[PDB]
Write a protein that binds this ligand. Structure first.
Ligand SMILES: CCCCCCCCCCCCCC(=O)O
Length: 90
C-alpha cells in the first residue's frame, strides 16, 4: 500500500542484500509480510514500484542477490526482482 511499509519490512534484508549468505528469520518474515499485504493488482504494482524506489536508494547492490530472496524464503514471486523491472507487466 505505502512505501513506508515496504521499506520497514525490507529493512532486515539489507544485511542479506549487501553481504549474501542466508537471510535471517527477520528478512524472510519481512518478505512474506510484504507479499501477504499486496493482494490486488494495484497493490502489487504499488509495492513493485516501492521496491524499485528502494533499489534506486541502494543502487550499488546486485540484483541477482535479491532474486535469490523468494526461493530462500519460500515464496514464488510474480516478478523478477531487478532494478529495471517494468512494474506495468503485472
Ligand atoms: C537490488 C534491486 C532489488 C531491490 C532489493 C530490495 C530493495 C533494496 C533494499 C532496501 C530496503 C529498504 C531498507 C531501508 O531503507 O531501511
Amino acid at each position: 500500500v505505502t512505501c513506508g511499509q515496504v521499506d520497514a519490512n525490507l529493512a532486515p534484508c539489507v544485511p542479506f542484500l549487501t553481504q549474501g549468505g542466508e537471510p535471517g528469520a527477520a528478512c524472510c518474515s519481512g518478505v512474506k509480510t510484504l507479499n501477504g499485504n499486496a493482494q490486488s493488482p494495484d497493490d502489487r504494482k504499488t509495492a513493485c514500484n516501492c521496491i524499485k524506489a528502494a533499489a534506486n536508494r541502494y543502487p550499488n547492490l546486485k540484483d541477482d542477490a535479491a532474486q535469490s530472496l523468494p526461493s530462500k524464503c519460500g515464496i514464488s514471486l510474480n516478478v523478477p526482482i531487478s532494478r529495471t523491472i517494468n512494474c506495468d507487466t503485472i
